[PDB]
Amino acid sequence: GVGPREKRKRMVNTHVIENNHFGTHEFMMLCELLGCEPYISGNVGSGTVQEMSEWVEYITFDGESPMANWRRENGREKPWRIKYWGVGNENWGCGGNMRAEYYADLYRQFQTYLRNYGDNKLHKIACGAWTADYHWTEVLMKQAAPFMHGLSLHYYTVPGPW
Amino acid sequence: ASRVVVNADRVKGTINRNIYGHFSEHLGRCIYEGLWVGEDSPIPNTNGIRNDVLEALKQMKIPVLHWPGGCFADEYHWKDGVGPREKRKRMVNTHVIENNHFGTHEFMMLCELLGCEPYISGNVGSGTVQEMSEWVEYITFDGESPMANWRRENGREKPWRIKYWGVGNENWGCGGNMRAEYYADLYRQFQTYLRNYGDNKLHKIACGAWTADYHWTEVLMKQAAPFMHGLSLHYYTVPGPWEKKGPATGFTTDEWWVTLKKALFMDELVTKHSAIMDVYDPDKRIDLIVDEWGTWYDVEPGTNPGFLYQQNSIRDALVAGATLHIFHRHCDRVRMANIAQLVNVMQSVILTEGERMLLTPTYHVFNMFKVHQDAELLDTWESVERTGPEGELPKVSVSASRAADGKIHISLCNLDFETGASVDIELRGLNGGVSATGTTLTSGRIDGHNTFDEPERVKPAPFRDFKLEGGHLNASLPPMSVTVLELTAG
């Protein structure tokens, strides 16, 4: 979702009709125009540690590096600031069908490599429970509390059966 | 006096020379003005490596060098440090100038120049399994493959040999903040794909405990012992709280005693960790490898705290002396150790500033003690005077080796800065009578250090302050001394 908009990746099928015209630059810009805080969730389920690490570099790094230089080629000179960074979402489900014990180990690992560049200071957020999985909350706090600034929770209001 | 017997005919094992090992990183000017200066530097160099340092390290007989090690291991992507030096990746913070001019080829070359063993740590924290696998292929594979062919493009035709391969470092901390249970699962997975190509034979090393995390050791041995050739251990000597460690020079007498007391804790750690290894590995197949040790102070005032620059007193020499003795005492299990670090960083053997370099007291110990490298430990039994303000510490630390050429070396540390130390030494199991030369390393001040202006304040001198009554050897050790005696039979 970065680089010349015209030559970004494209999934399309109506047997995902996604052109990636809206990516990181577009989003950060949006938050600037609205005057709201950006909150990004990185990819744990199908992503790698270097991938997520580099995303933060790309966005927040004021110095000279492949990622930062690439940000500038792509048209943003100064870094952006971001507080809220989610280290995966929905990891009990469509984000890897993980046990809490397991997501917690990945959370700890991934968050390790999300660095504070310039005077950016990250608020790291771990994926919390779905509805009433109090077990999930118990495990994440027991195993990862020291390594997180926040913990998420998901509850939709659904009148009927799924 | 302090009584010591040396059953000179009772070998107790081999002191693996790799105990006298070192370690360097890319956090600071360890690998950036200290060693690597560049092919086009005004400082006299051999293929980019300054010769003053080479000369000194060759003389010290460095046995093994560990790179990347520490935190850097689990940040590094090795492919960033190969290919045309001109076109390698470049990370630079203007507040860090990492240009990756020093990479795999440069390191292997360095180890060849020094005649030391290479010890590399792959990236578990932020790396992948294929990444690490490919690194070993790249280095060791004699056949035809993308990685091997790439090694040759990059200018090395035949494979290299490498024994010591670390599968992550510091994984409980800056290498992923992993639980032991978890690192162990990754270790098993990663190590699976590190193959022995050609006639290279890997010594696979799992990341072991920080300080007194006996739990970590227990779990790694319980879960992974069959899949490892060695297990690491990390313990720095820190005088104060982590938030205010204390200085390298101009420190109190309290800071002296506390520094040594902290250093000697190494014996407890090694004992207790070995104890656990014994349970899961009774025949001691698996090496214990203390790949991080040495003093850690606050940086010299008016230097960047992140650069870790610290001075090196006679204090630092005592720590080095006593700790090496402790490894000697544990050479049944301990088979490698790596002091932190090599140049300009923490407890370095060498400091540099432009084209000037000096040898630290710490250098002098490693140089003096090299007589113990691959030597044979001798049964020594001892009763030593206490010292220090509560009678805490031993006044004296002593060790005896038998070199290959038959000669006998006895190293002695006097930990009291305040007064010298008397040592009667009975030698049993002898052949003829014996004659004895001697070197000593001491200082006038408690923080005796070498500077670029006066780089020879603290250096080894001849030692003659002892009588040798063919059998007994009574000896008179200077305050804050490190001393080696060399005995020849007949």
Add this chain to the structure above:
Amino acid sequence: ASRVVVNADRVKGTINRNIYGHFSEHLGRCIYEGLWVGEDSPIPNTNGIRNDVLEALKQMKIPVLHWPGGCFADEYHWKDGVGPREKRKRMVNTHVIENNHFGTHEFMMLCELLGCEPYISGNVGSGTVQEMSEWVEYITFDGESPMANWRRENGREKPWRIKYWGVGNENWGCGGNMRAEYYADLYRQFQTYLRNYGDNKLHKIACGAWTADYHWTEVLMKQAAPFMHGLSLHYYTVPGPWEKKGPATGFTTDEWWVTLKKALFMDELVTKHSAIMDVYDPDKRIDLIVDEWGTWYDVEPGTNPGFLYQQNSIRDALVAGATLHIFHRHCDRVRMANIAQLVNVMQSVILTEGERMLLTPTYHVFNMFKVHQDAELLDTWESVERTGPEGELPKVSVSASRAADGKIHISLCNLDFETGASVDIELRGLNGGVSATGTTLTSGRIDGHNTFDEPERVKPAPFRDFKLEGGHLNASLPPMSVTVLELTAG
């Protein structure tokens, strides 16, 4: 030849005399013809205990006796064995006769007559907490209470003293088939209510592992180490399958080698169990107590298999000799051991048949070696000839103590039945020169045994087959020997 050095000035520790301990059960004629005969028996006795055996055990300097021990401990209800002997409980299987004539008073008295320590195992398996608690009250309480007053009615005014109290035995087996996790919880509970009355001080002992259940040891130390003074261990030497163990005499040369190989396995067990205890108890506060060991054969043909009556060859003496040596080598942790059993049962020191008794080869070793009881172990370094059909075993086992009176004792076992054994012994650390007496115990046949008809076939003789060149001591050991040398300084 076999080389041995004895650093005669280097004490390695104390050999707790309780290593030379024994153990008896209500099993056959151990407590019932072997020891207890009764006040008005025709066998000459002291308050019901036959004097021929007392005399012999007093001679041997028995240090400690364990009763009930084995399975019986966790079946016994101690109140069944106090009160008027006339009106005590009576269990009889007519297919084995328990009249409870030998109970608490009788046992305590026995230990007083022998001058040995009592070691009692309370009943966890089938007993209650108050039951065990009250037993200790009954024995040790100087004041006024139902239990103490009952002791006095039953004829003992002052309390007794007792150190060694076992909180169950064999709890993994015939004492409840308990998991370790579970026994540990009961151990903690029971031991809570065993109080120190008067100035009696209890040494509480938890039931340890059977053979190589290292798991049991791990769990007991992990869960209960703080609540115990000692931990037990059980290992019998069994030549064959459990269903067909092999005989005490008329056995093959293969059965000799196998028997000794099994016996020597004790070193591995003690090492590996100690290793684990070291992890949870680095300072070795807790005693390791091997309260069941010895050979276990098929019963003499045409005797009741359930009575466990077996003979005692020179083979049995070798096992006893070598095993005691192994305990010596481990006296840093091992502080008590109890051979099974005392009389007429398994590897007994004494056999009886009516008023006739004999001393077994095993007796002769315990008697010969008593010079080691509460002695000081000396640094010995050795290189020994191999023996046995695969070069399996050491030809020689040797150990050195320094008695209180300054004298030095060196015990030696030659495990080859086929030929004698040469042993050069260098003695360092001495003052004066030394003179040397010597005893040896050997045999014409590999199954050399004592019978009631010829009870002196195998007994200690003087040993003079050695030259002492005032420093070296070359010695010429008989086949299947056990040998003690006594050196006096000057």
